[PDB]
Every structure is written in structure tokens, then in C-alpha cells.
């Protein structure tokens, strides 16, 4: 729900953390 646990899995996105 949070942009936290999902954030760890968006390493494939263009430029996100």
C-alpha cells in the first residue's frame, strides 16, 4: 500500500531510488 515494500521491487524502473 505504502511506496516502501513495493519500492524495493521497482529496481527495474527507469530512475526510482
Amino acid at each position: 500500500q505504502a511506496e516502501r515494500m513495493s519500492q524495493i521491487k521497482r529496481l527495474l524502473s527507469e530512475k526510482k531510488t
Side-chain angles (χ1 to χ4, degrees):
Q1 181 271 290
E3 66 265 277
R4 244 72 82 142
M5 70 226 101
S6 206
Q7 190 204 320
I8 320 189
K9 276 69 135 199
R10 6 191 69 69
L11 322 193
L12 276 305
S13 227
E14 10 62 60
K15 205 274 296 123
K16 229 126 319 209
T17 90

